[PDB]
C-alpha cells in the first residue's frame, strides 16, 4: 500500500515532497497555534498520532483470503480534523517506515500526499455530504473510509503512472494497470475497514 524505499525517481520523490510541503506546513502552523493556545496539545496530538499508527499495525480480515492491516484514514477522519492529520500522517508514516520497515524515507512525502493529504480530505467530503445527504451516521462513516481508502489506491496508482508511464499506452497506461494490480488487493481492504470503522464509530458514541 505504501510506496517502498527508493521506488521513486529523485525527480519525483522530491517532486511530491514539494507538493506535500504546502500542506504539511499548513497543519504545522496551526499545531503551532494550538500548542501556543493550549500547551497540553503536545499530548492530545501525540496520543492522537500514536493511536493511528497502532491502529494500522493491527490486522483485519479481508473480504477475501487476504489479511490486511487497516489504514486509519477513514477513522481518523471523523474524529480528528483532516488538517491536523496532514502533519500527523507524516509523523505516523515515519514510524511505519522506521519500525515496520514498510514505509520509505525518499517516498515519505510522496506517501504523505495520498495517505495524509488526499485520503483524508476526501474522507470528510464523503462524511459531511453523506451527512448533508441525509444518510445515517452508520454509512456516512463507512463510505468515508471506503471511498477514502480508494482515494489512496487511486492517488498512489496515479503517482506510479506519472513516474512510470506506459511503454505503449502513454500516460494512463500504467494507470488502469496499477489500478488493476493493486485492485484485487485493496478493495477487499477498502470494504472491510469500511465496516470496521462503523463498528468502531459504533462503540465510540456508546462510551
Amino acid at each position: 500500500m505504501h510506496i517502498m524505499e527508493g521506488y521513486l525517481p529523485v525527480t519525483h520523490a522530491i517532486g511530491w515532497s514539494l507538493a506535500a510541503a504546502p500542506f504539511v506546513v499548513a497543519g504545522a502552523l496551526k499545531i503551532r497555534k494550538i500548542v501556543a493556545e493550549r500547551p497540553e496539545a503536545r499530548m492530545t496530538l501525540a496520543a492522537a498520532g500514536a493511536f493511528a499508527f497502532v491502529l494500522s499495525a493491527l490486522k483485519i480480515p479481508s473480504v477475501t483470503g487476504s489479511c490486511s492491516h487497516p489504514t486509519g484514514t477513514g477513522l481518523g477522519a471523523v474524529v480528528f480534523g483532516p488538517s491536523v492529520m496532514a502533519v500527523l500522517g507524516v509523523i505516523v508514516l515515519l514510524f511505519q517506515a522506521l519500525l515496520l520497515a514498510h514505509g520509505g524515507l525518499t517516498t515519505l512525502g510522496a506517501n504523505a500526499f495520498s495517505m495524509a493529504i488526499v485520503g483524508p480530505w476526501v474522507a470528510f467530503g464523503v462524511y459531511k455530504l453523506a451527512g448533508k445527504a441525509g444518510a445515517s451516521m452508520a454509512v456516512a462513516v463507512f463510505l468515508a473510509a471506503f471511498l477514502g481508502d480508494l482515494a489512496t489506491y487511486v492517488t498512489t496508482s496515479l503517482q506510479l503512472a506519472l513516474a512510470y508511464p506506459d511503454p505503449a499506452s502513454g500516460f494512463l497506461g500504467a494507470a488502469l494497470k496499477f489500478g488493476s494490480v493493486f485492485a484485487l488487493t485493496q478493495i477487499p481492504l477498502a470494504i472491510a475497514e469500511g465496516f470496521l470503522t462503523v463498528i468502531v464509530v459504533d462503540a465510540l458514541a456508546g462510551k
Partner: protein
C-alpha cells in the same frame, strides 16, 4: 505485525552508542545515492557498501533482518511485473525491454531499502527525531513526535493485552468474529490514549512544568573525523557510480 522487535534491536548491539551524526550520514547518504545513482554500475556496489556496514560495520545479528527485509519484496514483485507487461490496442504482450527496466527497479529499491534497514536497525527512531534539531523543524513537533513514539509503546502494550484477552475467551472462531473483535480493541484504544495523555500532564506538573519538554541527551559528538572519511567514500562511490 508490530514491531517491538526492530525497536529493541536498534538499542542493543554494537553501534547504537556511536554518534547519530554519522550513522545518519552512512544511512541518509547512501540512501540519497541509490535513488540518484544510475543503477547497474551504481546501487550494486552501494548495496555491498551499506551491507558491509550493516553486517560488518555494525554487526547486526540478523543475518535475520530479511525477515524485516522481505515484507517489501512482495510489494515490488508486482510493481516490477507491471513494467514487464502491458498495454495497447492489442490483447497482449510482454513489453520490449521489460526485464531491464524491472531489474533496474529491483536493484535501485533493494539498495535504498538496505539504506533504510541500516538506519532502522542501528539508529533508534528517537535519535533520528532529535537530529531534526539541527535543521528547520521547530521544537514543538519534535517534542510531539518524540512523544508519539512514546505513546506508541504504551498503547502497543495495552493493545497486545486486549487482543490477547479476546483471543482467549475465544476471540477467534469465525472470521467476522475476528474483525468484530479487533474493532473492540481499536474503539477501545482511543479514549485510553486521550486519558493517558491527561494523566501525563498532571504527572509532569510535578516538575514545575507540563509542556515544553527540554531534555538532555547522552549521544556522542561524531568527530569531524569520520565525517571526512565517510563523506569521501560516498562521493567516491558516486563518481564511480556515475562513471
Amino acid at each position: 505485525m508490530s514491531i517491538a522487535s526492530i525497536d529493541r534491536v536498534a538499542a542493543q548491539g554494537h553501534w547504537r552508542s556511536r554518534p547519530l551524526a554519522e550513522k545518519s550520514l552512512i544511512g541518509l547518504g547512501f540512501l540519497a545515492l541509490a535513488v540518484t545513482v544510475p543503477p547497474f554500475p551504481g546501487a550494486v556496489l552501494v548495496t555491498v557498501a551499506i551491507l558491509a556496514f550493516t553486517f560488518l560495520g555494525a554487526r547486526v545479528p540478523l543475518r535475520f533482518w530479511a525477515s524485516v527485509a522481505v515484507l517489501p519484496l512482495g510489494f515490488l514483485t508486482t510493481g516490477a511485473a507491471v513494467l514487464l507487461i502491458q498495454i495497447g490496442p492489442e490483447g497482449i504482450g510482454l513489453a520490449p525491454d521489460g526485464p531491464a527496466k524491472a531489474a533496474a527497479l529491483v536493484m535501485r529499491a533493494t539498495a535504498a531499502t538496505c539504506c533504510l534497514l541500516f538506519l532502522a536497525t542501528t539508529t533508534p527512531a528517537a535519535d533520528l527525531l532529535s537530529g531534526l534539531r539541527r535543521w528547520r523543524v521547530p521544537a514543538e513537533l519534535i517534542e510531539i513526535a518524540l512523544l508519539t513514539y512514546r505513546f506508541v509503546f504504551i498503547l502497543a502494550e495495552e493493545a497486545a493485552a486486549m487482543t490477547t484477552a479476546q483471543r482467549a475467551r475465544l476471540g477467534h472462531a469465525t472470521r467476522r468474529r475476528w474483525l468484530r473483535s479487533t474493532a473492540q480493541v481499536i474503539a477501545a484504544l482511543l479514549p485510553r490514549a486521550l486519558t493517558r495523555a491527561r494523566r501525563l500532564e498532571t504527572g509532569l506538573g510535578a516538575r514545575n512544568w507540563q509542556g515544553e519538554m527540554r531534555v538532555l541527551s547522552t549521544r556522542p559528538p561524531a568527530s569531524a573525523r569520520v565525517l571526512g572519511l565517510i563523506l569521501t567514500l560516498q562521493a567516491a562511490i558516486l563518481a564511480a557510480g556515475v562513471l
